[PDB]
C-alpha cells in the first residue's frame, strides 16, 4: 500500500543575508517539498 523511506533531519539554519521567501516558512514547518531552507519549493 504505502511505504516510507526516511533519512536525516531538516536544518533550521536560515541565512538572513538573502531576501525573505515563502520557501522558508514551508521548510521550517515540515512541509513536503524540494529544496533547502534558503530556497524551498513547497509543491
Amino acid at each position: 500500500t504505502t511505504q516510507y523511506l526516511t533519512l536525516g533531519e531538516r536544518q533550521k539554519n536560515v541565512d538572513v543575508s538573502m531576501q525573505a521567501s515563502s520557501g522558508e516558512l514551508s521548510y521550517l514547518r515540515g512541509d513536503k517539498g524540494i529544496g533547502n531552507a534558503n530556497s524551498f519549493v513547497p509543491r
Binding site: L5, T6, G8, G33, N36
Partner: protein, 949 residues
C-alpha cells in the same frame, strides 16, 4: 630558546649603551583587495631604512610589552600614537573601525654605532621580531585644560599571532562553498575564491545540503501480469490470476531525505565517526534499492576498519557477541578489519580505495564502496554508470540526464563511502551508518632530512604539525615558520618507549592504532584524535596540546612547540646577572592533586565512554584522605595504558611546585617559555638549580620579566635518561648548493579563477640533500614565496606561478633551506614582466572642440578630451585610465588618473597656473599639446600601445 647570532651576543655583552628602535610596519585598508599599502613608523629619532623600506619617525609615542606564557591564549599589545598629528587623528576617528583585523609587525632593532642595524636574527641577519598580529579597536582621548597644557593620545590595541587561530577553517558539504561560487548577491556564478583551483570543476557535493520530502510514485516492476507462482493441489486446476512476474504496478512510496550540511571532521589514528550523507536516492523502478553516500573523513586517509550498521559492527568483538549476532571473524585478538570479508587476510589490512564489499547479516544485503580521499581521484564508476542509464528515481523526477552524477563529481580530498541497502521486511528503513577509520596520512620528518607520509601517525607533535600546516582544514602556517630540528627532537621525546605495561596485555591492539601485533607499539604518548572542524582552530589546537601537556608559543616569529622536559644543557642564570628584585613563592598546598577522573572511550565495549578514575593511594594518605581531582583531557586517548601512565605522571608532577619571579637584562634576549634554566644563588644554597620558564615578558626598555617554575627531582617525562650527541647537537652539513635553471617564462594568455595571470618561474632542486623547501624573495613584497619540495623532486624540477603582478620589472631571489636551517646562496633573476591581462586599446580618442576648417586645432580656451569606454569592461570589475600630457619639446605636464568617466575636461586655468609656472616658473601658455592614455585594471592589468590623437 631562540638562538641569536654570535656577533649579536658579542655586541650585547661588550656594549652598554644600546640604541634600540621599534620598526612598526602597519597595514593600511583599501576598498578593493587588489590594492594594498603599508604605513611604516618608528620611535627612533631619525627615519630608519631597512631592506629599502623607509620607516618614518615622529608619530609613535610608546609601545606596551609583549607577555606570553605556557598556556595558549590570544596575547595583546597596545602602542600609542601622538594625537597632535592630523593624519593619525583623522585616520582613527573616521576610519578606526575599518582598521579592525589589519596586520601589524614590530621589529626590535639595535642600531649600530655607524647607524646601521646590527644583524641579530640568524635567519635573515635582520632585527629580532618583537610582535606580529592584527589590530582590534582603537581610541583617542583629548583632555584640554583651560589653563595649562592638554594632551591628545591615540591608542591602538592589537593581538599577537594567535589571533589568526580564532578562524574556523573547515570544509563544508555545501556545494557553493566547496566550489567557491561568488556570494549570492541575487545571482550565483563561480568565483576565484576557493581552497583549490581544481575544486571549481568538482561537483561531488551537488545534490547535497538539500531536502526531498515528497509522496513519490514508483512504477515498480512485477506483480501486475504474467504467470503466477501458485499451483493448486488439484492436478488440473491452475491459478489463472496473473501476478508475481514482470509488469509495472503503481506504488506510492513516501520517501523523506534530508541531506544536512555538516562540517567534515579530520581524524588521526583510529577512531569511530558517523556518516554525513551527501547524496541519497533509490532505483528508478525498485524503491527497495537505496543509494546513500556518506562523507566520513578528510584528506588521504587509510582504509576503513569496519562499518557500524546501526549499532552492530560487521565484525564482532568476542565469541559471545559472535554467537549473539552472527558476525564475521573477530576483532579482539585476531583484530580483523573490513578486508576480511573480501578475502582471507593474513594481515589486518584496512579497506582498499575503490573496492566493493558485500555484507549479509541475515536481515538483508549491504554493498559498500570504500573511496578514500585523494588529491586526484576519479568519480564513483558505479554511480556514473547507473546515471548514464537514468536508474535513479530522483534524477528522472527532476529531469536530469547523464549529467546527474557525471565524471566531474569526483569528491576531491574527501573519504566517502557508497552504501547500497536492499530494503526488505527485515531492514525496513535506513539505519544511521558509522564506521571505524584510520587517520589522515601525516608527514613524519626524519632528522636525516628524508620524510615519509605513507601512514597515519599517533605522535602528538606530528599530528599538530599536520593540523598547523594544512590550508584546507587547519591554520595555514607555512613550513618556514618552524624550527625543524627542534620539532623533530620533541617528536622523538614523545616517542620514548614506556615500560609500565607489556604489549600482550591489551587485546584490541588493532583498534588502538597499533598497526602491528609484534612491533614496539609502546610510545609514552599515543593520540587518536577526531578534529571536529566546526570548533575554532584555537580550540582544536588547545585540545591537542592538553593531551600530552605540551605548549605552543610564538616569540620572534618562530612557532615553538615544546613540552616540559628535562634538559642537560640549561641556560646558566646567576642572581647577580639578574636585576635586584627576586621573589620565591610556594604553591604546593593549592596545587596538590591525588585523583583524576578519566572519561575515555574503550573500543572493546563499542566506542562508548568508561567513567574511570585514577587515584594515588599514597597521595591520599598524605592529603589526609581528602580528594583533589585535576581536570585532565582523555578525549584524544583510547589506549587505556597510555591514559593511565599519563594520569600517574601528571599526579606525580603536581606534588612539588614553586614560582620564582625575577627580571633579567636585555643580554638574555629570546628566552622562550618552557625553557631550561640553571639558576645559581649561593646565599640560598642553589647551584645550577633546574627551573622551567613559565612566563616571559619583553619590554621595549629591554628588560625581560621572568617567572620560573620549580618541579620535583625526577618528575619529568624525559627524566632518568641521557640525551645522545646526535639529537643534542646538529651534525655538520655542507651549505646547500644553489638551485639551477632559475628561469622565468611569460604566459601570454593567463587566467586562474578569472584573474590575471603573469608568467611562471621555475628552478631545479638543490643537489644538497635534506632540503625541505625553496624560499623565493620577490621585490616589493613582505612575504617571500615558499614552496616545499617533494620526495620526487630529486628528478623533476619544481615550478611556482606568479599571478596578478603589474607589468614591469621584478627581482626574484631564490634560495633553499636545510632542516638544520642551513641556506643556499641566493639566486637572482632580474626580468621585466608583462601585464597580467593585456587590455584592449581605447577604441577612439579625439577632441570634441576641434576646428572644422582643419583637424588637430582646438578653438576654445578649454580642451575637451573624450574617448570610448573600453570594451571587455564587464570582464574586469574596477578599471581606470591614466592620461599624460606632453609639451612641444617633450616635457610631461600632468599625469591624471580617471575612473568611471570617459570625458576629460582640460581647463585653461590648469594649463597656465599649474603647468607654465611649474615648468618654467613664469606665467605662460602652452599652445602645442600632446596626450597619451592607457587603460589599466587593478590586479596587474595594463593596456598595450598607449593611445593618442
Amino acid at each position: 630558546m631562540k638562538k641569536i647570532l654570535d656577533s649579536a651576543k658579542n655586541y650585547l655583552n661588550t656594549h652598554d649603551k644600546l640604541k634600540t628602535a621599534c620598526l612598526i610596519a602597519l597595514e593600511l585598508p583599501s576598498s578593493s583587495g587588489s590594492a594594498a599599502t603599508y604605513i611604516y613608523l618608528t620611535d627612533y629619532f631619525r627615519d630608519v631604512t631597512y631592506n629599502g623600506i623607509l620607516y618614518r619617525s615622529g608619530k609613535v609615542k610608546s609601545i606596551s610589552s609583549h607577555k606570553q606564557n605556557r598556556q595558549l591564549s590570544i596575547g595583546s599589545l597596545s602602542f600609542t600614537i601622538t594625537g597632535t598629528a592630523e593624519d593619525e587623528v583623522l585616520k582613527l576617528v573616521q576610519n578606526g573601525v575599518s582598521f579592525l583585523d589589519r596586520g601589524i609587525t614590530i621589529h626590535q632593532a639595535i642600531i649600530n654605532e655607524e647607524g646601521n642595524i646590527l644583524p641579530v636574527d640568524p635567519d635573515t641577519d635582520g632585527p629580532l621580531l618583537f610582535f606580529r598580529g592584527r589590530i582590534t579597536g582603537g581610541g583617542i582621548k583629548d583632555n584640554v585644560n583651560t589653563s595649562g597644557i592638554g594632551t591628545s593620545v591615540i591608542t591602538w590595541n592589537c593581538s599577537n599571532q594567535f589571533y589568526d587561530f580564532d578562524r574556523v577553517n573547515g570544509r563544508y558539504t555545501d556545494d557553493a562553498s566547496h566550489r567557491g561560487l561568488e556570494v549570492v548577491n541575487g545571482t550565483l556564478q563561480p568565483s576565484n575564491g576557493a581552497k583549490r583551483p581544481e575544486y571549481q570543476e568538482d561537483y561531488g557535493f551537488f545534490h547535497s545540503n538539500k531536502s526531498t520530502t515528497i509522496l513519490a510514485k514508483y512504477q515498480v516492476k512485477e506483480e501486475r501480469y504474467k504467470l503466477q507462482s501458485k499451483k493448486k493441489l488439484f492436478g488440473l486446476s491452475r491459478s489463472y490470476s496473473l501476478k508475481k512476474y514482470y509488469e509495472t504496478v503503481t506504488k506510492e512510496v513516501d520517501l523523506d531525505f534530508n541531506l544536512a550540511a555538516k562540517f567534515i571532521p579530520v581524524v588521526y589514528g583510529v577512531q569511530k565517526i558517523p556518516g554525513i550523507p551527501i547524496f541519497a536516492d533509490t532505483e528508478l523502478n525498485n524503491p527497495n534499492i537505496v543509494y546513500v553516500v556518506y562523507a566520513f573523513a578528510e584528506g588521504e586517509i587509510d582504509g576503513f576498519l569496519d562499518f557500524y550498521i546501526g549499532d552492530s559492527p560487521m565484525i564482532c568483538f568476542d565469541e559471545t557477541d559472535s554467537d549473539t549476532r552472527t558476525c564475521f571473524g573477530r576483532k579482539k585478538i585476531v583484530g580483523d578489519t573490513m578486508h576480511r570479508l573480501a578475502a582471507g587476510t593474513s594481515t589486518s589490512q584496512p579497506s582498499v580505495h575503490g573496492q566493493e564489499y558485500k555484507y549479509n547479516d541475515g536481515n538483508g544485503d549491504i554493498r559498500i564502496w570504500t573511496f578514500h580521499g585523494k588529491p586526484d581521484q576519479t568519480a564513483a564508476q558505479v554511480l556514473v554508470d547507473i546515471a548514464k542509464k537514468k536508474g535513479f528515481y530522483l534524477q528522472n523526477q527532476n529531469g536530469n540526464g547523464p549529467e546527474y552524477w557525471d565524471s566531474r563529481y569526483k569528491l576531491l580530498d574527501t573519504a566517502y563511502a557508497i552504501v547500497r541497502f536492499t530494503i526488505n521486511e527485515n531492514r525496513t528503513e535506513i539505519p544511521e551508518i558509522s564506521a571505524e577509520v584510520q587517520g589522515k596520512k601525516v608527514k613524519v620528518y626524519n632528522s636525516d632530512g628524508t620524510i615519509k607520509a605513507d601512514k597515519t601517525s599517533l605522535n602528538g607533535i606530528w599530528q599538530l604539525m599536520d593540523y598547523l600546516t594544512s590550508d584546507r582544514y587547519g591554520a595555514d602556517i607555512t613550513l618556514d615558520q618552524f624550527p625543524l630540528q627542534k620539532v623533530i627532537s620533541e617528536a622523538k621525546i614523545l616517542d620514548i618507549i614506556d615500560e609500565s605495561y607489556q604489549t600482550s596485555w591489551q587485546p584490541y591492539w588493532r583498534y588502538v592504532g597499533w598497526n602491528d601485533p609484534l612491533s614496539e607499539n609502546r610510545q609514552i604518548v599515543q593520540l587518536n584524535t577526531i578534529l571536529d572542524t566546526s570548533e575554532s582552530v584555537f580550540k582544536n589546537v588547545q585540545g591537542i596540546l592538553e593531551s600530552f601537556g605540551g605548549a605552543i608559543n610564538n616569540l620572534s616569529g618562530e612557532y615553538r612547540i615544546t613540552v616540559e622536559k628535562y634538559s642537560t644543557n640549561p641556560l646558566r642564570i646567576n642572581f647577580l646577572d639578574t636585576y635586584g628584585d627576586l621573589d620565591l613563592s610556594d604553591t604546593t598546598g593549592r596545587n596538590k592533586f591525588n585523583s583524576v577522573q578519566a572519561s575515555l572511550v574503550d573500543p572493546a565495549l563499542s566506542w562508548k565512554t568508561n567513567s574511570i578514575t585514577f587515584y594515588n593511594s599514597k597521595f591520599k594518605e598524605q592529603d589526609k584522605g581528602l580528594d583533589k581531582k585535576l581536570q585532565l583531557s582523555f578525549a584524544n586517548i583510547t589506549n587505556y595504558y597510555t591514559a593511565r601512565s599519563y594520569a600517574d605522571r601528571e599526579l606525580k608532577k603536581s606534588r612539588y611546585s614553586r614560582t620564582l619571579s625575577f627580571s633579567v637584562p636585555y643580554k638574555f634576549i629570546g628566552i622562550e617559555p618552557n625553557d631550561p634554566i640553571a639558576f645559581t644563588y649561593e646565599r640560598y644554597g642553589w647551584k645550577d638549580k633546574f627551573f622551567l620558564v613559565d612566563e616571559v615578558e619583553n619590554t621595549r626598555d629591554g628588560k625581560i620579566n621572568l617567572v620560573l617554575q620549580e618541579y620535583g627531582e625526577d618528575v619529568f617525562i624525559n627524566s632518568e635518561q641521557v640525551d645522545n650527541s646526535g639529537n643534542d647537537i646538529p651534525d655538520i652539513s655542507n651549505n646547500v648548493l644553489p638551485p639551477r635553471d632559475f628561469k622565468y617564462t611569460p604566459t601570454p594568455g593567463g587566467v586562474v579563477g578569472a584573474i590575471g595571470k603573469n608568467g611562471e618561474l621555475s628552478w631545479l632542486p638543490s643537489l644538497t640533500n635534506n632540503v625541505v623547501y625553496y624560499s623565493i624573495a620577490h621585490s616589493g613584497h613582505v612575504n617571500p614565496y615558499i614552496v616545499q619540495q617533494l620526495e620526487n623532486n630529486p628528478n623533476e624540477r619544481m615550478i611556482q606561478e606568479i599571478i596578478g603582478e603589474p607589468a614591469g620589472l621584478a627581482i626574484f631571489e631564490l634560495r633553499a633551506v636545510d632542516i638544520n636551517g642551513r641556506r643556499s646562496s641566493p639566486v637572482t633573476l632580474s626580468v621585466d614582466l608583462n601585464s597580467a591581462k593585456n587590455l584592449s586599446v581605447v577604441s577612439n580618442f579625439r577632441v570634441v572642440n576641434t576646428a572644422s576648417g582643419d583637424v588637430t586645432e582646438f578653438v576654445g580656451p578649454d580642451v575637451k578630451l573624450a574617448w570610448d569606454k573600453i570594451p571587455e569592461e564587464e570582464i574586469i570589475p574596477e578599471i581606470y585610465y591614466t592620461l599624460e600630457i606632453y609639451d612641444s619639446q617633450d616635457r610631461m605636464l600632468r599625469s591624471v588618473r580617471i575612473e568611471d568617466v570617459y570625458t576629460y575636461d582640460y581647463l585653461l586655468t590648469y594649463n597656465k597656473a599649474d603647468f607654465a609656472l611649474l615648468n618654467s616658473g613664469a606665467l605662460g601658455i602652452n599652445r602645442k599639446l600632446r596626450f597619451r592614455i592607457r587603460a589599466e585594471g587593478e590586479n596587474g592589468e595594463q593596456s598595450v600601445g598607449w593611445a593618442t590623437i
